[PDB]
């Protein structure tokens, strides 16, 4: 891929973000792409499991994940981020840092802060995982990322 | 590059690590490669400038830098690391984590801990920066990384 990009998953708890993230990785790998999944809880457990949940710790973790996605996306990798957070602030920061950025909002009918204008909105637990994956990939194609 | 790799600079303060790191980046970009430089102090200042200098904070920063290098190198990026530290422990951990790992020791005649068997040993200030860059690239070629 001449240009990598980030697929940033967001939605309330239970919407299916984690499942979709890993299914996207499996499919895009099968297709021959360079792909990495940045699962927030995995990264935390691997790099600083005892950092705590203070504000400063939460924003450091956010900056680390975002920087990991920025470097991976600018070097031709498809970066799938599943970073647990209800807040828009981290997602707006991520979009400012990562040039090629595709936000996937899984909508279910702190309080979850909805995005303004995500690249893709999917209704939770309606379509099969395969259809969710195909919908994300078609959006990436429409955006010129794939 | 079907396979990326890490160039890990080590040596005592003043040996010329930083100068070689940035010259290597400039040369490899001009050759058309995907390259990232992971400058330890730049990464600390960007991602967590107020983390402090405790043992836990030092080890967290080391793990972050190494994980960045690991993910970039496995995805076709030449990762040039210049992480200030006199200690072998971080370098041995990095080598265990990063499959394609090329250690470049700039030797100068809290105390610096020499590596056992680095892929390349350069005598500090003995050759021009251009010749140091060329020697690193030739070593990478000998190892089959380039
Ligand atoms: Cl495709
Ligand atoms: Cl070359």
Numbering used by the authors:
A (entry chain A), B (entry chain B): 16 to 124, 153 to 189
Sentences copied from the publication:
(1b) Alternatively, APS can be further phosphorylated to 3′-phosphoadenosine 5′-phosphosulfate (PAPS) by the APS kinase (APSK). The APS-kinase model from M. thermolithotrophicus, MtAPSK, was refined to 1.77 Å. MtAPSK forms a homodimer with an organization very similar to bacterial enzymes, which was expected due to its high sequence conservation. Despite co-crystallization and soaking the crystals with APS and MgCl2, the MtAPSK structure was obtained in its apo state with a bound phosphate at the expected position of the ATP β-phosphate. The N terminus and region 125–152 (the latter being involved in substrate binding) could not be modelled due to the lack of electron density. However, the residues binding the substrates and Mg2+ are conserved, suggesting that MtAPSK should be functional, as confirmed by the coupled enzyme assay. The activity of the recombinantly expressed MtATPS and MtAPSK was tested via a coupled assay and a specific activity of 0.070 ± 0.004 µmol of oxidized NADH min−1 mg−1 of MtATPS was measured.
